[PDB]
Amino acid sequence: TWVDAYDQKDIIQPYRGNPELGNLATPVNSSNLVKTYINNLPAYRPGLTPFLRGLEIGMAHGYFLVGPEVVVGPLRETAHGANLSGLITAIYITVSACLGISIFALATFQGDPRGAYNSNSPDRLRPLRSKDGWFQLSGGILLGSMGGAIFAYVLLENFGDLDAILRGAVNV
Amino acid sequence: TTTWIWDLHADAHDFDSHTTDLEDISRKIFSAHFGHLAVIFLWLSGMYFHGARFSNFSSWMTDPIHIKPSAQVVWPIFGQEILNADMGDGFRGIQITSGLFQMWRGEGFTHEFQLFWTAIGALVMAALMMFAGWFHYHVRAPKLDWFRNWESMMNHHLAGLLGLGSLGWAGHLIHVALPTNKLLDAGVPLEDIPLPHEFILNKSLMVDLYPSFAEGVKPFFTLNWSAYADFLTFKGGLNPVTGGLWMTDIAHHHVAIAVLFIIAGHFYRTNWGIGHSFRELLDDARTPKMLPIFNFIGPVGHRGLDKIFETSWHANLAIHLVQFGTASLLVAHHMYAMPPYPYLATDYATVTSLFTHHVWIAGFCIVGGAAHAAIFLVRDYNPADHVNNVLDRTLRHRDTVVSHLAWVCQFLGFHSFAMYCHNDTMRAFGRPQDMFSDTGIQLQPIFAQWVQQIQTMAVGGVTAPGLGGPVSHAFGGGVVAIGDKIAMMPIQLGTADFLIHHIHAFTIHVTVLVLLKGVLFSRNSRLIPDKGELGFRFPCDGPGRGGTCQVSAWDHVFLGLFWMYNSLSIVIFHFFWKMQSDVWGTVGADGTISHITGGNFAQASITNNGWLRDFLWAQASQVIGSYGSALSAYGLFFLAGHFIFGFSLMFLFSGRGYWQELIESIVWAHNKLKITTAIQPRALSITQGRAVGVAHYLLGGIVTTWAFFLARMAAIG
Amino acid sequence: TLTGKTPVFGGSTGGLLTRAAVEEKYAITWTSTKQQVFEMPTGGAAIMHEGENLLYLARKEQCLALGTQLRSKFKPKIEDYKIYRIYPNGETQYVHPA
Amino acid sequence: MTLSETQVFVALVIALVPAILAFRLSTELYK
Amino acid sequence: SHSVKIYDTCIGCTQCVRACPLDVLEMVPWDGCKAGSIASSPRTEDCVGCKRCETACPTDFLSIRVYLGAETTRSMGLAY
Amino acid sequence: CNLFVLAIGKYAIQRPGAGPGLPELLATASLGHILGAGMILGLGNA
Amino acid sequence: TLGWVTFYWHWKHLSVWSGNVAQFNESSTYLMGWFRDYLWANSAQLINGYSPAGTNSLAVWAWMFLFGHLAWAVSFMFLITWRGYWQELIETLMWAHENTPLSFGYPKDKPVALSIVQARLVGLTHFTVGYIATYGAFLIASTSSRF
Amino acid sequence: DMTQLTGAYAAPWLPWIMIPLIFYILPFPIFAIIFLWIERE
Amino acid sequence: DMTQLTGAYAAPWLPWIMIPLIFYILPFPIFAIIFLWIERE
Ligand code: F6C
Ligand code: CLA
Ligand code: CLA
Ligand SMILES: CC1=C(/C=C/C(C)=C/C=C/C(C)=C/C=C/C=C(C)/C=C/C=C(C)/C=C/C2=C(C)CCCC2(C)C)C(C)(C)CCC1
Ligand SMILES: CCCCCCCCCCCCO[C@@H]1O[C@H](CO)[C@@H](O[C@H]2O[C@H](CO)[C@@H](O)[C@H](O)[C@H]2O)[C@H](O)[C@H]1O
Ligand SMILES: CC1=C(C/C=C(\C)CCC[C@H](C)CCC[C@H](C)CCCC(C)C)C(=O)c2ccccc2C1=O
Ligand code: SF4
Ligand SMILES: [Ca+2]
């Protein structure tokens, strides 16, 4: 009754062909579409310097973090005040997150680290295995998210001239 | 010891705890079900007898707008006859909130002998149930292949129990309840109402109420069914005299579902080759036979699942308790919004009590469905039957299921409840424009508002041209008024309704999280790899591994009872405030609606302070100002429910090691005066102290809400 | 140094984690006389092979709970199970029976 | 009158369904 | 780690060794009781502290006592 | 009537268990009265 | 016990200071009189410190009143639910973190549930903070708004 | 109306963002993705 | 006076800077310093 179980093909497989590992190979973690997308995100893109990983992660993140306080925050009744409070929110979150990245690296990499950053760890999802990769990612995320936030701030502060550009009103 | 006394009452009705033979277990179950039917028939005999002998039912049937229903009189001892309140019509009793009078009027009852002969028939059929339980156990008990005939049981319960039950009730509606309620709504007094057999003997007496009866049963057999379209109607809306549903819609309902259920009772193959079998339906639900969206369920699929239903009574009790929760939740939501009984919707004490009762019945049944799901996995589940099927694969990704549920519970708790704490803080600051409100930062429930607009546009008649009125007036349409009292009106949904619905989604998802983690980790976990060998119900596995208190599947049912209580209390509080604020009230002589609490749900229910002040503090003035009046039993039950809640925390917060060392000193003082007993005084066990603490917590909290709901609605409702 | 077929198993989310590769691991090896279904301590059902088996587990309590099931839930009993502790440098220590 | 804003947003949401089905047809046809 | 002490009231019934899910306890020959054997705790660094051995001990008071000590990864029962 | 003839013309094709014959006639006649009642009422209003 | 002591001191003195010392004398002999005339009657301006009608100087005491009711309720989680429920929940969260991409953090200290003694202490701390912040807000706001 | 691009249709902000997205924001990422696809070894 | 936080006491700019410093500027550096103190080996 159970003898022909595990003989027909199944789209759910043991993770890395090992049924003793505590994971499964699903379409969400192991299909060709999600592996092409996730492994080419700047956290995982092969060959990148740790700083350039941080710069792309920062520039994407600081850009959208200006957004929420501009539209729904306490300064939202005036345009110039809402853009400033959205910029300061993205600045404060970035400094706090990059302080957390730095003190993570100062705490984890003391001798041989415990857990996923140990020298024996086969953690494919956590590949930044040295402290100089973490400090360069910290500086990359800081500079990228500061730049992405002030880019969103400059676009939103000049929204009246930027809307006139995108409607051809500058050609009068 | 005294532990044997408590263990005997707890080991009473679980039958596989004895010698486990399935045929003898199935026979004790089949005859105990006859005994529980005799208890229901004995309780139904009491409600019809107290309705026939101790009521104002004949007085209430004359004018049901100004008479309060009473069916319980109280003896004059200890001064307790103050609870006999004036109901109108000179009758002194207790205002009942069960709605028996509105049920009996819609069924066709007109006198107090018809309720008497219904009470005799329930007293007779209770004696017939406790003979069938004796006969089918002590004399002629069936054997196991009779219990395992699923296809015959499904065919006989769809077509025979539900199909012939609702066809037979459609016979009572058409020949008794349709003429009796048509004459009552056209204003005919109760001396002039014919007794319900005269609508059959005098066939001509039903001709002038329904002219299609002169043409007989002949259009039914010739499929000229449109001849009957005056007593079987697809109307919709409410009766403007009673506020109930149209009785001709009720008859055509119980006709259409009768044909649909008798058709459903020919689906399964029993003795004649025709039909589907349960095994062939379950052995085919697998890859590659399913849709390609469901390729994840694998090649075995549902193939090993029919051995569950061959052997496990607990697994069938798990499904059936869940669906009685689904049915009782439908009974709660559909009977307030489509009120099916005459003069029900304007009896606000009854609409409150009927919603609240059937919500609470459903919530206990859902916890029992998860409790007996965990009993099946511990006791009845054999892993050899389930290799790579949907039961085995669910247990092999239980860490993904519980951790994804734990995330969405945290998301729902932040994005529902912490927005109330945002709103409390913004209002205290004097920044109401920064609140989540209809006048601040709006959260319009646009998908529910879209459904309400669809449900109104469907009748006209874009997608249901056959109705005249709406399916419910809660969706749209207009105001239905009975006796200058609102029966049902459109229920507007704003930011306060977006927030409370995501509170409900939060508290249900956590209750699922407590119960599903108890079921999925009932046999083993990374902490206790042999948890199933310790049983379904055990206190812990010692203070080691950090501490393993409440790892058993029983203790997750214990924690799930608190979370069900917390979930359903907010559900009935949402109902009680929103109906008083936006639905119930009075149509004035001007033409304007003045609700009970005046429309304050939209602005005050968005903070915790408004629920404390405008709901809890304001509306409890009837239950605390009831001393020295007829509602004083509610005032005593209000404080009594507060007592048992605080009393329950002695059992929940403490442990039995304290109480056992406290007992030895009292055992010492009893021994110095030579009055010792043989049965040795023990503290309650760790599981007994949890069971006592959760039972008194739920009793204390529900009785408090019951006294608060019923004292307010018996005064101003 | 450790012989045995891995039991037929589709994998689960209850198996080995980061601790198994960086601190310590455990393996239980037993012989069976027939192909039969057992319950994994990590949840679910696996199929042991006729002959020598080998299963890697995360805790020593999971291997001893499997050996308790092998001694008590199968006729004939499976008593010959050996439990090892595997260190990340490959150093294998024989811990049960001692 | 012409389309409403809810009609345009319905068409944009529905068009994600042939966008996904063309992606899985393109990757099935080959690389 | 925890501390598992075996006292000389042990009647050598081997029930603590059968109850232990971590194989902490074994029987050694003693000549101090009728059964000729006493419980010992050699692998006490594997003890999780479940106290299943004390639940199994028939001697009044218990011949085996577990003292919860310093928490390690093994004594906390962590698979992660 | 023409739906009952359709039932005995296209449901000697669909049924694995035929003959336990007597009762799949009663099933095929029952489905003819079901599809007959739906089509007569369907054609009754077009 | 100190709840019963300070309830009696406050209700007797609120009756003496208002001149309504008689109203203490019929109502203090039954428990509804403490419930209706001390707890319910003196809560009226405290819970109106902010409302849809506006905010006033009792708003910090109304907010602390709900804050104290909240901390008392968080207490019941630590006192009714015990350890091994939470320890098995943390293993599923430790599973989810290890198998989630882009989550580069990893706990240096292994996450465990709070110990049996610790959550009796944590639950008693939330109970006590919830006890004192509730009554302390009620004692200030009911006395200072009546006098 | 006559001095700049407007739209008298439903959601007139949609061409305001879609034509920048389709024609000069997304093409260089799409050209870079296609370039990495045809150069990979 | 009634529209914003003012101070009619000496050095009213002191709560203008001390409450930002004490409550949301300095705590995350202090939490980071304490975190490095309790994690160091
Ligand atoms: C650090 C690192 C890390 C990471 C990375 O890296 C992470 C991540 C994850 C993911 C994966 C997920 C999803 C996300 C979410 O949604 O959720 C929220 C959260 C958050 C938001 C958190 C996050 C955090 C971030 C990332 C960081 C930040 C930091 C700051 C900013 C700094 C500052 C500094 C100063 C000094 C203060 C998760 C989660 C969870 N958690 Mg988990 N994390 C962690 C941390 C932590 C800690 C400490 C604790 C204790 C409290 C916990 C807890 C928890 C719980 C209960 C849960 C859940 O439920 C979830 C889950 O599982 O689902 C499924 N967790 N997380
Ligand atoms: C059409 C015939 C028929 C009918 C009406 C029923 C009805 C019932 N069966 Mg079922 N049963 C049937 C055929 C039928 N059975 C067959 C053929 C099998 C073998 C496959 C079974 C095997 C079976 C088992 C193992 C069990 C039942 C149970 C039940 C009860 C459901 C639980 C309940 O409380 O219902 C709700 C009750 C009502 C809706 C009220 C109406 C029911 C009345 C009071 C029953 C007595 C009247 C009369 C006998 C029914 C009308 C027939 C009469 C006109 C000739 C219900 C009385 C359960 C039970 O409770 O047993 C006592 C149960 O455990 N049945
Ligand atoms: C059709 C419904 C149904 C059926 C047939 C069963 C049957 C069973 N249940 Mg299940 N269960 C159900 C619903 C049901 N239950 C529901 C709704 C819940 C959620 C509360 C549960 C949760 C549950 C748990 C947690 C357990 C069971 C167990 C059992 C088994 C033994 C029962 C026993 O010995 O208690 C005998 C009855 C009592 C001891 C009565 C006590 C009930 C409460 C505390 C008192 C009533 C309060 C009252 C309404 C308030 C008035 C107070 C006033 C009088 C002062 C038996 C197979 C047990 C078992 O052994 O499974 C292996 C077990 O541990 N059930
Ligand atoms: C839908 C979808 C999705 C998603 C996506 C998303 C989520 C997006 C995002 C987006 C974003 C999130 C974006 C970002 C952007 C950013 C940027 C692009 C930035 C830039 C920057 C700059 C430019 C800056 C500069 C500077 C500096 C650096 C310094 C100095 C100053 C200045 C300002 C000059 C996916 C794919 C999943 C899938 C499919 C669909
Ligand atoms: C589980 C559900 C998750 C819920 C997530 C909730 C997150 C926060 C919700 C805010 C998002 C929507 O919030 C939306 O914002 C706009 C802009 O302020 C509000 O806009 C409204 O208030 C602002 C006040 O300045 C005015 O500019 C605007 O004229 C008015 O319409 C809308 O009332 C609100 O609907
Ligand atoms: C108070 C308390 C006790 C003590 C409670 C006890 C001992 C219950 C005693 C109840 C019995 C029924 C008292 C009555 C004894 C006789 C039955 C009296 C006969 C009276 C009849 C003639 C009416 C525990 O044992 C306990 C255990 C675990 C956690 C918490 C607690 C806990 O809080
Ligand atoms: S405190 Fe009680 S329930 Fe918890 S481990 Fe100890 S004995 Fe068991
Ligand atoms: Ca503002």
Residue numbers in the entry:
A (entry chain aL): 8 to 179
B (entry chain aA): 44 to 503, 528 to 784
C (entry chain aD): 4 to 101
D (entry chain cM): 1 to 31
E (entry chain aC): 2 to 81
F (entry chain aK): 35 to 54, 68 to 93
G (entry chain aB): 596 to 742
H (entry chain cI), I (entry chain aI): 3 to 43
Provide text from the study.
Among the two photosystems, PSI catalyzes the light-driven electron transfer from the plastocyanin (or cytochrome c6) at the lumenal side of the thylakoid membranes to ferredoxin at the stromal side. The PsaA and PsaB subunits bind Chl a/Chl a′ as the primary electron donor (P700), and A0 (Chl), A1 (quinone), and Fx (4Fe-4S cluster) as the electron acceptors. Here we analyzed the high-resolution structures of the PSI core complexes from H. hongdechloris grown under white (white PSI) and far-red (far-red PSI) light conditions by cryo-electron microscopy (cryo-EM). We purified the trimeric PSI cores from H. hongdechloris grown under white and far-red light conditions and solved their structures by cryo-EM single particle analyses at resolutions of 2.35 and 2.41 Å, respectively.
In the atomic model of the far-red PSI, each monomer contains six membrane-spanning subunits (PsaA, PsaB, PsaI, PsaK, PsaL, and PsaM) and three stromal subunits (PsaC, PsaD, and PsaE). However, we identified seven molecules of Chl f (f826A, f827A, f830A, f832A, f844A, f810B, and f825B) in the monomer of the far-red PSI based on the difference density maps calculated between the cryo-EM experimental maps of the white PSI and that of the far-red PSI, as well as between the cryo-EM experimental map of the far-red PSI and the calculated density map derived from the atomic models of the far-red PSI with all Chls assigned as Chl a. Other cofactors in the far-red PSI include 83 Chl a, 16 β-carotene, 3 [4Fe-4S] cluster, 2 phylloquinones and 2 lipid molecules in a monomer. Among them, five Chl f (f826A, f827A, f830A, f832A, and f844A) are coordinated by PsaA and the other two Chl f (f810B and f825B) are coordinated by PsaB. However, we found that all of the seven Chl f molecules are located at the periphery region of the PSI core as well as in the interfacing regions among the PSI monomers, and all RC Chls, including the special pair, A−1, and A0, are Chl a molecules in the far-red PSI. In the PsaA subunit, loop1 (Ala232-Asp244) located at the lumenal side of white PSI was deleted in the far-red PSI, whereas loop2 (Pro331-Asn338) is inserted in the far-red PSI, which was found to be located at the stromal side. In the PsaL subunit, loop3 (Thr8-Leu28) and loop4 (Gln117-Pro134) are inserted in the far-red PSI, which are located at the stromal side in the structure. At the Chl f826A-binding site, W367 and W371 of PsaA in the white PSI are changed to I362 and Q366 with relatively smaller side chains in the far-red PSI; among them, Q366 is hydrogen-bonded to the oxygen atom of the formyl group of f826A with a distance of 3.2 Å. At the f844A-binding site, V699 of PsaB in the white PSI is changed to G700 in the far-red PSI, with its main chain nitrogen associated with the oxygen atom of the formyl group of f844A at 2.9 Å.
